[PDB]
Write a protein that binds this ligand. Structure first.
Ligand SMILES: [Ca+2]
Ligand SMILES: [Ca+2]
Ligand SMILES: [Ca+2]
Ligand SMILES: [Ca+2]
Ligand SMILES: [Ca+2]
Ligand SMILES: [Ca+2]
Ligand SMILES: [Ca+2]
Ligand SMILES: [Ca+2]
Ligand SMILES: [K+]
Ligand SMILES: [K+]
Ligand SMILES: [K+]
Ligand SMILES: [K+]
Lengths: 146, 361, 361, 361, 361, 146, 146, 146
C-alpha cells in the first residue's frame, strides 16, 4: 500500500534531508551534523550504536529500506523495548549492565509501590540465569519475547 | 513495509476526512438557529409550521452530528491501538477518556426541541430600580449554548496543518522528542503571526457577543437602548477597553455576564497587543549601522564649528583689549559672554558624541 | 550529641501543635458570627435566647483562643532562650516583642458581647442626595473586624512547610547563612506556582468583600440593589478590573472603603497576572530548534522557485523579441512586468531568509 | 556623466517643488471650510451670497489641487522610467498603482458644493431616551471628510528630510542595500525624538477631535452640554485616559465614533509614553561609578562602627560581671541586649555591603 | 592658601543659610491663608477686623520673602563671579537668567490683598443641566496659586544633601567631570529609595488636591456632595486609579481641571509603582542556589520512585501471563494500563528534571 | 542640463568619506574599513573584483570620475545584469560558473511556472555556444546585448 | 529527651548528601564540591581549617558523630565565640592576628558609642598577657569561660 | 576668610582616599588605581604629566599642599587655560602641536562665524613668533598674560 508515488516521494524528500552527499547512503558525518543542528551533542559511540541497531546489512551505512524501518519504529509513541531498558539503566552504576541481586531486592522492597517479600524473592530467583547473583539484560528480552 | 506505515496513513486520512462533516453539520445548525430566532420575534409567532420545520432540521442535524462524533472516537481508539502496540481495545479506557467523550456528547446534544413551552421572567431595571415581569419562552435558554460547538474549528485547523502532517516534520520531531499537540501549534501561530490571530479572534468575539447581548436584552426593553445592534456593538467595544458603561447598563444578568467576560478578555489581550505593536517600531541591523554612520558624520562637523567659535572669541577679546588705543567696555563683555557660550556648546557636543560612540561600541 | 538536637525538636513539635487549636477556635468564631448575623436579620429579633447562646459560644471560643496565644508566646520565648544561649528569660523582652504580643491580643480580643445595644446611623443616598436615618445595633461594628483573625493561616502554612522542617534543608541553609523567615516561603511559592496563589487569593477576597459590602449596605437600602449578593459580586468584579460603577454606587462609607481596597488590589495584581500569562506562551529549546529547521527548509524551496521565474521571463522576452518575424508588443510588456515582479519576489525572499539566519545565529 | 546623474536631480527638484502647492491648496480649503461652518450657524443663513462665495473658493481650490496631483503622478512615472531601465510608460501600470491614484483622487475630490440641500435627522437622547427630530443640511456630511487631506504633510516631510536627499546618505544606503521607505524616516524620528512626535500628534488630535465632536453635536443639543468647546476638550481628554464619561455622553453616533477612535488611540499610546518616561530617570555610565564609590565609602564607616560597638559591649559585660564584687543584675541584662543588637547590626551591614559589591561586580 | 577654598566655603554657607528663611516665610503665609479661608466661611464675614489682621500678616510675610529672594540671587551672582573668574558682574546677565528671576518674583508676589472686592460667578450643574449664579469674592482667585511656592522645599533639599556638600564627593565629581544639579540628586533618590518618595508625593498631592477641590466646589453646592472633605478624598482616590466618577462630578471647571491633573499623574505613576513592586518578590543569589539544590534533591527521589514501578508492572504482567495455569484477563489489562501510566510518569519527570538542569546551566 | 558646481561639491564631500589620508585615491584598505564599519564581512578577492569592475584605468585605484560612475550605476533600483547573474549563482554549484544542460532542463521543467518541453529544448539548443553541454555566463550577455 | 530513630534517619539522610560513594567519611574534595555548588569559592586552607575545628579524632575526616556536633553548633542563631572574633578580624591588618595597644586605644576612643579614657586604660590593663604592646586572640578566650 | 580646622580635617579625610598604606605621598600607582575604578582608561604618560603639572617640588610625588592646589584649581567650572588649549588639539593632528598658517587661514575663514579676511591676516601676522608658518602653543599664553 506504500507503493503509491505520493508517500514514496514524501519519504524520499525526508531522506534527502539527511543525505547531503547525493549518493543514497548515510554516513556518520551527516547524522552527526543533523543531530548537532537540533541542539543535541552526539558522541561517536552512541551514534555508532544507533546506526548499527538499524543496519541489518552490516555495511555501516543506511539506505532507503533501512531508513523506512527506522522511521516506522521511531514514529510510534511507546516502545516497550527501550522504555524499560532505560529504566534499568536508571539504577545502573558504571554502565556495565551488571546489577547485583541485593540491589534489586532493596529497590523492589523499599522504593516504588512496594512488593511482598516472597514475590520479589521469587522474581530474583527466576532472574538469575545461572545463579551468580548478578543479572544481565537478557532477562529483559526473556520477558519481552512473549 | 508489511502493511505498516501504510495502515497508519490510511487511518490518518479517514480521521481527517471525518472531521469536516461535523463542522458542516454544526455550522448548519447554528445558522438555522440564528435565522429562526430572528424571524420568530416579528415575522411569525411560535405556533406556525415554519417553526416546526426549522426545528426539525435542527434535530436532524444534531442526530447526524452525534453519530459522526461517535465514529470519530472509534477511529481514534483504533489509531491508539495500532500506535501503542495493544491488542485489546479495553486497554484504552482510562476514566478521563470516557469523561471527555461524555462531555463532548453533552455539549453537542443541546438544541431547541420542537413544541411550545413558556416560563416566567422577572428583572430589575437599571437607573430606576423598577420591577418587570414577562412571559418568555424556553427556547432562549436552549439556543444560546450552541456557541459551545465552536471547538471543532480548532480540531479541523490542527488536523489540516502542514506541521502535523508531514513526513520530514514527523521525522525531525521523532529525533528531537516532542509532543505534537494543539498547544504546540497555537504557540507556533503566535510566534509567526502574532497580530492576525488576535485580530480575527477580536473581530469574531465582538459580533458574537453583540448578538448575544441583543438577544438577551430584547425581552425587558421598550425604549430601543440595549436591543439595538449598533448600541450593543458600542457597549462591547467600550467595555473591552475598560472605559465605562455610559447610560447603557443591562437589565439582565445575561448581559452582565457577557460584559464581565469581555472585560476579562480585554484586560488580558490589550497588554499583548501593545507589546507586539512595539516590535514593529524598530530598526534592523543594516539601517541601525547607516543611522550611526550618519550621526557620527554630523557630530564631527558640529564639533569643528564649536571649536572654531571658541577660537575666534579669544582673538576678538585680545584685539579689542591690548591692540586698541581706546578701550571700549561695551564690546569686551559681549565677547566674553559669547566665549563662555561657545565653551559650553563645545562641551555639550563633545559629551554627546562620546556617549553615542560608547553606546554604539 | 544527646540532650541537644532532641530538646529543640521537642520544642519545635510543641510549638507546631499549639498552632492548630488557634486556627480551629478562630474559624469557629468567624463561622458562628456569620450565621448569627444572617439569622438575626429576619428569623429572630435581638432579644431571643438564640442570640444569647450564639454569642456566649463566641465569648468562650475567644477566651480559649487568648489562652492558646499566650501559651504559644511562652513556648517561643523558651525556644529563643535555648537558641541564643541565655539563662534569664528577661533578655528576650525588646520593646517591639512586647508591642507585637499586645497587637495580637488586641486583634484577637474583639467580638460582639451579649446584650442589646443600639445607636443612630445616618447616610446620604447616591444619585438622589436624600438623607436617611435608622437605629442600627452595635454588633455590626464589632463583627466585621473578625476577619483580621485570618493571619493564623500564614503561621500554620509556614510551620507546616517542608522547607522549614527538613534536616537537610536546614543544614544547607545554615551552611549558606540563610535566614528562614515567612517572606522566604512566600517568594518560594511565587517562584513555584505563581498562578495558583493568585487564583486562591482572588477567589477568597471576592467572596469576603462581597459579603462585607452586602452586610454594610443592607441597612440603608429599600430597593434590593446593593443588598443583593449577586449584585455585590458584580460590583466587586467590575471595580477590581477598573471599568466603572454602573448604577450601583454605595450609600455607605463602609462600602466605599471596601471598593477602594479592591480597586487598589486589582491595580496591583493585574500586571502580575498578565506577566505570568505571557510567560506561558513561548517555546522550549527543542521545539524552537525544530521550528527553525522547518522554516529554513521551506525558505530554501521558496527561494528556488522565485529564482526560476527570472530566467524563465528572460528567455521568453528574448525569444518573443528576436526569434519572431513580427513583433507583438503586448506580450513583451507583460513579460517585462512579470520579470520585474520575479526580481522583487526573489529579493524579498532572500532578505527574509538572511534575517532569519542572522537571528538564529 | 553622459547627461545622466543630473537629469535625475532635475526630476527630484521638480517633484519636490510640486508637493508644496498641493499642501497650500489643501490647507486653504480646510481653513475656509472651518470658517464657513462656524459663521453659517448664527451670522448668516444658507441662502446669502457669502455662502456662495465661500463655496466657490473651495471648488476652485479643489480643481487646482486635482490638477497638481495628476501632474505629480506624471512626474513620478517619469522618475520610475528613468530609474528602472524602460522605454514605454505602459510598463509602470501595475493595477495597485492605478488603485492608489484613484483612491487619492477620490479622497481629494470631496467638498461641499454650492447650493441649498437639506435632509432629515433623528436621534435618541442620552440618559432620558427621548426621540429627537431636526431638518439638517447636507453640507455637514461633505465637510468632515476634508480632514483626510492631511496625508500630504507626511509626503512633504519625507521629501524635505536630509536623510532622503543627501549624496552621502544615498551612497551609504546603496552600499548597504537599504530601501529609503517612508516608514524608515518614521522609525528614525521615533528613535531620535520619541517625545516631541507624541506630544505634537496628541495635541493636534485633541483639538481636531474636539472641534469635530462639537460640530456633530450642535444639532441635537439645547442645553449647552456637548456643543461647548471646553466641554468637548474635557470629554476627549478623559476618554483618552480611559476614566469614564461623566454626565457627558453623546446623543449622536458621530460623537460616539470619535470617542471610540480616541479611546483606541489612547490605549495604544499611553504605554509608549510611560516607556519613554521611564528612560529619563536612570543614571548615565559616568555617574554610576561615582555613586558606587560613595556608597562603598559610607559602608566601610558603618561596619567599622558596628564592630567597635560589639567589642565595647563585650568588654563592659566582662568588667561588670567578673570584676565588681557586688554583682548588679540590672546592668548585665541591658549590656547583653545591646551586645545582641550590635551583633545583628554588624551582620546586616556586612550582608548589604557584600550584596552591593557583588552587584557592582 | 591663595584666598581660595576659604571664600568659596563662606559663600556656600551664606547661600545655604539664606534658603531657610524663605521656606519659613512661605509656609507661614500658606498656613495663614488656609486658616483664614476656613474661618471666613461662617465664623465671621469679610468686613470684620480679623480678616484685616490676617491679611496684613500675609502682606508682611510676602514683602520679607521678596527681599530674601533678591538677596539670595545677589549671593548667587557673587558665587558665579568667583567661580568663572570674572571681574565685572555684568557678564552674568544672559537673558534667561533675568527671565528666571522675574518668573520667581512673579510667582512669589501673589497673595490676597486686604479689602472687600466681589465678582459674579455662574456655573452649570452636573446631571441636571441647570444654571446657577452667585456673588463670590476675589480672594479665591488669589489664594489657590500660593501652592506654587513649593519649589523652595526642593531647593532646600538640594542645598542640604550630603552629596552636594562634601569635599571628597566634589573631588571625585570633578575628577570624573560630573555636574551637580537637582536632576542628579532626584535620580539618585530614585535609585536609593524608589518607594518612600513616591508614597510621600502621593499622600501630599492627595491632601492638597482634596482641599482645593472642596474650596472650589463649596460655592455652587447646596446638597453636601462635593464640598465634603471625605467625599473629595474619595473622588481624588478613584480618579487617580482611573475607575470612574460615580455620582460625584464637579459643577466647576476648577474641580474638573484638578481631576484632569490627578488623572494624568496617576496614569504616569501607577506603572512605576507596579514596576518597583515586582523587584521585592525575587530571591537573592544564596536563596536561588539553595532552592535549586533542594529542587534537584527532590527530583532525584521522584525519578527513582517513577522508575521502580515500570519494572514492578513488567514482572507482574509476566507472572500473571506465563506462570499461572489459568489465564485471568481482568488483571492483565489493569497491569498493562498501570505500566503505561508508569512509563508516562517517568518520561514527564525526566523531562522536568532535564529542563530545570538546563535552566540552571 | 549636465552638472552644476553645486552638486559637484556634495559629491566630492561624499567621496571624501572613503578617501582617507587625502591623496585623492581609494585603496583596498580604505574601502575595506568602510565596509567593515557597516557590519559586512568583506573578502580580499571580493574587494579586488569590486574595484576592478569599475576601474577602467587598470591602476588598481579609484579616482573621482570612476567613483562617480560607480555611484551612478549603483544608485538605480534594479540592475538587469546583476539581478539575473545572481539567479544563476543560486543554482550554481562549487562556484565553477558552469551549468550542465541536465540541470537546466530539470530546473525549467519542474521548478517555477514551468515551460513546455519543446520550448525548453529549443532554449538549451540555443544556449550551448558550442554544444559541449556546459553552458556558462557568456551566453547570458547574448540576451542583454540588445 | 535524647534522640530517637526517626530523627536519626533524617540526619543520616542529610549526611548522605556530603559523603559520596558510600565511603562513610567526609573528605576535603567531597566538602569542596558541595560548597562550590552553592556559589561560594572555598580555598584549600579554608577546607582544612574548617574540618580540623570539628575533627576531634585527628584522622582528617568527618564521621557521623562529628557531623552531629558540627550541625548542632552551626544550627544556632548567634555564636558569641565567632562573632567577636570576626569583629576583631575587621580591625585586623594583613592577616597576622596581632593588634597593638596603640591601635586599640584609638579604636575604642574614636569609634562607636565612645568610651572614657579611664575605662580604656582599665581595659588595656590585663588585656596584654605579657605587656609588650600587642594584643592577640588568646585574651579573647579568657573573658568567655568566666 | 582663612581655612579653619574643620575644613582641614575634611580635606585630609578626602586626601586619605588617594593616599593608601599611609605613605603620606601620592604615587603614580595610587592615582592610577583610583582612576581605574572610576571607569576611565589612564595611560602611564598621562598620569606622569598630570602629576608633574601640579607638583612644583620636582620629586614626582604629591603632598597635602599640592593636593590642595590641584583641588582648588579643579573645582572651578571653566578653566580657560585648558578650554582653549583643547580647541587647538581638536584641529591639531599627528600630536605635534605645530599647526601651520594655511590650516588656521582655512579654519577661521570657512568655519564658525566666518571672520573677515582682513582680520585673519592680522591675526596670523601676530600669531607667528618668527614667521616660519608653524604656529605653536606658545602663542596661547601671550593672550593670557594680560
Ligand atoms: Ca551521504
Ligand atoms: Ca545498509
Ligand atoms: Ca587614499
Ligand atoms: Ca583609477
Ligand atoms: Ca567519602
Ligand atoms: Ca573523625
Ligand atoms: Ca602613598
Ligand atoms: Ca611633592
Ligand atoms: K465610568
Ligand atoms: K482603566
Ligand atoms: K450616571
Ligand atoms: K474606567
Amino acid at each position: 500500500d506504500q507503493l503509491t508515488e505520493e508517500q514514496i516521494a514524501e519519504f524520499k524528500e525526508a531522506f534527502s534531508l539527511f543525505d547531503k552527499d547525493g549518493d543514497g547512503t548515510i554516513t556518520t558525518k551527516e547524522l552527526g551534523t543533523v543531530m548537532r543542528s537540533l541542539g543535541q551533542n552526539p558522541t561517536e559511540a552512541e551514534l555508532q550504536d544507533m546506526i548499527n541497531e538499524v543496519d541489518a546489512d552490516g555495511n555501516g551505512t543506511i539506505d532507503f529500506p533501512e531508513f523506512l524501518t527506522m522511521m516506522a519504529r521511531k514514529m510510534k509513541d511507546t516502545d516497550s523495548e527501550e522504555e524499560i531498558r532505560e529504566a534499568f539503566r536508571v539504577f545502573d552504576k558504571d554502565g556495565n549492565g551488571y546489577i547485583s541481586a541485593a540491589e534489586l531486592r532493596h529497590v523492589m522492597t523499599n522504593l516504588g509501590e512496594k512488593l511482598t517479600d516472597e514475590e520479589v524473592d521469587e522474581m530474583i530467583r527466576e532472574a538469575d540465569i545461572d545463579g551468580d547473583g548478578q543479572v544481565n539484560y537478557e532477562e529483559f528480552v526473556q520477558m519481552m519475547t512473549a | 513495509i508489511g502493511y505498516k506505515l501504510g495502515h497508519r496513513r490510511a487511518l490518518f486520512e479517514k480521521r481527517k476526512r471525518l472531521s469536516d462533516y461535523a463542522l458542516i453539520f454544526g455550522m448548519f445548525g447554528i445558522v438555522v438557529m440564528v435565522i429562526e430566532t430572528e424571524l420568530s420575534w416579528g415575522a411569525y409567532d411560535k405556533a406556525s409550521l415554519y417553526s416546526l420545520a426549522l426545528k426539525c432540521l435542527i434535530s436532524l442535524s444534531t442526530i447526524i452530528l452525534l453519530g459522526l462524533i461517535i465514529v470519530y472516537h472509534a477511529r481514534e481508539i483504533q489509531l491508539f491501538m495500532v500506535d501503542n502496540g495493544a491488542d485489546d481495545w479495553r486497554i484504552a479506557m482510562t476514566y478521563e477518556r470516557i469523561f471527555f467523550i461524555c462531555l463532548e456528547i453533552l455539549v453537542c446534544a443541546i438544541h431547541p426541541i420542537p413544541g411550545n413551552y413558556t416560563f416566567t421572567w422577572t428583572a430589575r431595571l437599571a437607573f430606576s430600580y423598577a420591577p418587570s415581569t414577562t412571559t418568555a419562552d424556553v427556547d432562549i435558554i436552549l439556543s444560546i449554548p450552541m456557541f459551545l460547538r465552536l471547538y471543532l474549528i480548532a480540531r479541523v485547523m490542527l488536523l489540516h496543518s502542514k506541521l502535523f502532517t508531514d513526513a520530514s516534520s514527523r521525522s525531525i520531531g521523532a529525533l528531537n522528542k516532542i509532543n505534537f499537540n494543539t498547544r504546540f501549534v497555537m504557540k507556533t501561530l503566535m510566534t509567526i503571526c502574532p497580530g492576525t490571530v488576535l485580530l480575527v479572534f477580536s473581530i469574531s468575539l465582538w459580533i458574537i457577543a453583540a448578538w448575544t447581548v441583543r438577544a438577551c436584552e430584547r425581552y425587558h426593553d421598550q425604549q430601543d437602548v440595549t436591543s439595538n445592534f449598533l448600541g450593543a456593538m458600542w457597549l462591547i467595544s467600550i467595555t473591552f477597553l475598560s472605559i465605562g458603561y455610559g447610560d447603557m447598563v443591562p437589565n439582565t444578568y445575561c448581559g452582565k455576564g457577557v460584559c464581565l467576560l469581555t472585560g476579562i478578555m480585554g484586560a488580558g489581550c490589550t497588554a499583548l497587543v501593545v507589546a507586539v505593536v512595539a516590535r514593529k517600531l524598530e530598526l534592523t541591523k543594516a539601517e541601525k549601522h547607516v543611522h550611526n554612520f550618519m550621526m557620527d558624520t554630523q557630530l564631527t562637523k558640529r564639533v569643528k564649528n564649536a571649536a572654531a567659535n571658541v577660537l575666534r572669541e579669544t582673538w576678538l577679546i585680545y584685539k579689542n583689549t591690548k591692540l586698541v588705543k581706546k578701550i571700549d567696555h561695551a564690546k569686551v563683555r559681549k565677547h566674553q559672554r559669547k566665549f563662555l557660550q561657545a565653551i559650553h556648546q563645545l562641551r555639550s557636543v563633545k559629551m554627546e558624541q562620546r556617549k553615542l560612540n560608547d553606546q554604539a561600541n
